[PDB]
Amino acid sequence: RCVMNRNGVNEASVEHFYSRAGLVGVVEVKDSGTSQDGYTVWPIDVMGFVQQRRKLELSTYMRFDAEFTFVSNLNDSTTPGMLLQYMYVPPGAPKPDGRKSYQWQTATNPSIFAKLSDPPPQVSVPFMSPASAYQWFYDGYPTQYGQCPNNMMGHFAIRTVSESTTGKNVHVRVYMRIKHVRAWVPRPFRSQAYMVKNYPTYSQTISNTAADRASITTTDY
Amino acid sequence: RCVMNRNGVNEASVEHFYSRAGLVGVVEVKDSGTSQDGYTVWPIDVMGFVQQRRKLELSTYMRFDAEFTFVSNLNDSTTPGMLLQYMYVPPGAPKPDGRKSYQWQTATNPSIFAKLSDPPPQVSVPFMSPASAYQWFYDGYPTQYGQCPNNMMGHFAIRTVSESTTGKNVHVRVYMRIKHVRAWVPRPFRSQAYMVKNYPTYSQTISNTAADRASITTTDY
Amino acid sequence: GLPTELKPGTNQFLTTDDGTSPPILPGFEPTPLIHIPGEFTSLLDLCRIETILEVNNTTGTTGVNRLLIPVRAQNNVDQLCASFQVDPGRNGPWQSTMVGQICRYYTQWSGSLKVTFMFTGSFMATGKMLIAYTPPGSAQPTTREAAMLGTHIVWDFGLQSSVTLVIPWISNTHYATGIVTIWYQTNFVVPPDTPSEANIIALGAAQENFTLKLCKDTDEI
Amino acid sequence: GLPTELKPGTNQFLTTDDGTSPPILPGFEPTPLIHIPGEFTSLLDLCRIETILEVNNTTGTTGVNRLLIPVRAQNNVDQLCASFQVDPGRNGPWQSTMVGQICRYYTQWSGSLKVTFMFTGSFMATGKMLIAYTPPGSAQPTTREAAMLGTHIVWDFGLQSSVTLVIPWISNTHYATGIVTIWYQTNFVVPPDTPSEANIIALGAAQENFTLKLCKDTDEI
Amino acid sequence: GLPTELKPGTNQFLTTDDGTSPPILPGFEPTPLIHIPGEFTSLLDLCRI
Amino acid sequence: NIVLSYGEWPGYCPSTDATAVDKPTRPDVSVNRFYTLSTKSWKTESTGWYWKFPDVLNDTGVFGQNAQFHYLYRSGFCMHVQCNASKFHQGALLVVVIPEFVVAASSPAQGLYPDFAHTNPGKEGQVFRDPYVLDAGIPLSQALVFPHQWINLRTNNCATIIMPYVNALPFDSALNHSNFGLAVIPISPLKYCNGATTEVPITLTIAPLNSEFSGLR
């Protein structure tokens, strides 16, 4: 009927708001048919999905640590003993060009060796920006408009540790948990549909923030 | 734009510089086709790759402990329940001659018995030199020039614990982490391409340390 | 100790588990945090900021006109100017407010709201509006006489440009909302050469006792 | 205790994990460490050692000649002798320095540099050079008059054989570099039977406030 | 505690690892040790003969 | 009376490693003075105006000289927005300071990227195309989370906002990064009767606060 009491303040904190591990990317390691790459390079994008992009863009500046979990299996959900390498390429480091490129052996690129039959690999990436916080909104030019390169968090290059093609596609579900989040300068929530991935661009067909009703005096929609 | 602050001193230490586990050898245990050996003997070489050789040769003398990790799988990245023996042959001990030689049973050669389905085997090799430090540069004769035998760290003999040929090749990726490193007498970084594995030899075609420009007054390359 | 049993929940990835994972880059020192103004640690602080209500959310009204309640000289007396429900969660005028947007990220909320009205007519314009609040039990009042019997404020333009209405308690669960109605207590009175039409801007916010429960993804995006 | 759950990250080999592994040879006592002179525990100590800049890194110059800035009697006045950017990381004269070589093992660096000039002409040779530093904002000065307006040093050979220039701050990220220009303030003046050509040797080093971030493998080797 | 990660070196048999294993016959009391002359605890004592 | 943005008085930056070796320039009244921009004509059909900071003062007086010929910049601002309206004029203006005001382009349902005249409007400022979404895809109704003041013509004709330096870095380039945008949006449109002045002047006065410059070219 009516909640007589108060719900507490814990779940209204910024720490709780930006918490819980969430899907930030579905990486496919194709090794069969027309795509026998046997590896994939996935740029770390906290704003891959619109739901998370809208929540993060409530802030202007944000400092956090990210914990990544890789949930990997084959097409039919099976997890055999295939060995996989999860390489973290820090910002400003070369990326692998092929299945057996020399960047897979670079010691300064941290790697995780895990089997598909193992529980999901997990690792914490620290705060990586040259600035004191990540900028979701940068109003200026590097030297395109609004493209700050200080929000590069790195790359996850994933391959099967194999000699020739295995004929098996590996689906990697990347889960990211924001940790020790601090947010600066609250902003309005986005009200328009996102057009592109890195811009505030919106369509000329502007949608009204509030749903329409018949008249300013009626209370039925 | 510009990094206003300082980055700290932790990552500029010798301990951090020579740290992180790095690939030092890819050992193939061949058991099929024309090569049915079923075992391999791998000499422990910290300077197997030029990238690590150049970093180590920044020092003259270096004392450290080495931690080795063996990442093993088959050609198609599979890791079934095959049992493997990782034998450490200390410096000045006989090496296995075959798949079933008696040196596989020597108690003073430490062994690791691990399955391919197990997480990678790991073990620490202590500082092994008869001298107080490893010499990357020895200017003298044993009694060839510059060949000091005090840098022998031992051998990793790897076999499948099997009676006859299995028909399966095992790829072993050896990862080494330098621990408790102390370095003496800084040296210039190598500027010439390496010709051979154990000598400072360089080609007569000498490459300039600095990239060329048009003139000493222009700043465009 | 050394004896151990693995319990149910072993090898499970719970996306809400706040565990510990090893750092990808140990001894990496992030950019030290400078002071940045405008740090917010709670979404309730944003809920307590007054934001414009889209009360004129009618069919055919576009752009900034949707934020304005029209007030004009009335041929008839005691007429109803505008009504809206005090329901931050559901579709309607509260969709354009910050508290309305935050409530859609949660399942349950309770507390007191704050509604401010701003009259933006001429300095010379005078008159009275009756601002009536109906608790969630009843329907919209039919006449100004009925609205005067419940909780109400008589607002004079010539004396106060702005009045605050406090809704004592609203709540929601997995709406029980009141209604605010604006009545023409008097005719809109102006001297000659003064516009006979004006606007009311309605703002909405939460009080210090508002709370949120069970974080839930928004259906706006 | 005895009850236990295995979390995500179980059975993973993270190449940067600084764990513990059992010793291969327990009760082995390594050679005790004697005192060896010249222990270094930091790469910043090597960055702070002056090393020769390859300022004459022009096409067709080979061998030791690339380390010498030629100075001769000039028919024209106020001419530019040599210029180079103060950029340890990128290709150019700093490639031949120790700080230039170490910066390629890291991604980001900041701090003050030190440039020393050594005049190696006759004891009887005299003259003035204007050594000008341009901050990263501007381009190369076009005239000695323009260079005299910014940060500069007027250097007399007959009084001081060597001068130190301090670059207040340079930085790099995942170049924002200044420029050093050497101008002929005066003509090269010699008595009879004295060579009219001489050389300047430029040395480069880092100050006590230089730092390095995010260790990254070098592209030299 | 209850949260746990298994590191590399799990499930490996290192022949030089001086671990602990459960006794095959718990509560078995071995023959008590009498004094025997000529105990040697070092091979260097034999080297010095 | 005076809106202090985020309850933070502008001040000189604490000791910095880069600024320790060469102390930054702190100019006085010569730079930190009042700059009065060109007046804006508020009309019935006006959608509003915005200015970028410090882009608005980047080619104006001694501040413009310091901004162009220094590598690094840091400053707070004290901004006064004044109206000249009669008591027979009516309307409401919202004056909002938007940190990192990234202006979006509008794609016909394809301009997905705003031009330099919109991102850096200069001292003359720029008119809003879609004030309802602030030309940035975010609702005007929620723009009150930013520091703001109302100008209701029947109560007050002036607004004062003090904005401190807000950035992820202690210093930045004045010429290619705008710290914040100042937007003036008529919420309630200007109304008047025949014979009144058809426009209400809007005057923006700016005073830099605790300006700091580093690395003079």
Residue numbers in the entry:
A (entry chain A), B (entry chain A): 62 to 204, 215 to 292
C (entry chain C), D (entry chain C): 1 to 174, 187 to 233
E (entry chain C): 1 to 49
F (entry chain B): 30 to 138, 144 to 251
Q: What does the literature reporting this entry say, word for word?
A:
Coxsackievirus A6 (CV-A6) has recently overtaken enterovirus A71 and CV-A16 as the primary causative agent of hand, foot, and mouth disease worldwide. The genome is released through a capsid opening, leaving the empty capsid as the non-infectious end product. The major capsid proteins VP1, VP2, and VP3 are arranged with pseudo-T = 3 icosahedral symmetry with VP1 subunits forming pentamers around the fivefold axes and VP2 and VP3 forming heterohexamers around the threefold symmetry axes of the capsid.
The structure of the CV-A6 virion was determined to a resolution of 2.68 Å, whereas those of the altered and empty particles reached resolutions of 2.50 and 2.82 Å, respectively. The buried surface area of 4400 Å2 per protomer within the altered capsid is less than half than that of the virion. Like the previously studied enteroviruses, the conversion of CV-A6 virions to the altered particles is connected to the loss of ordered structures of VP4 subunits and the N- and C-termini of the major capsid proteins, but also of surface loops of VP1, VP2, and VP3. The centre of mass of the protomer in the expanded altered particle is 135 Å from the particle centre, whereas it is 130 Å in the virion. Residues 45–47 from the N-terminal AB loop of VP2 form a short α-helix located near the twofold symmetry axis of the altered particle, whereas in the empty particle these residues are disordered. Because of its position, the α-helix may stabilise the altered particle prior to genome release.
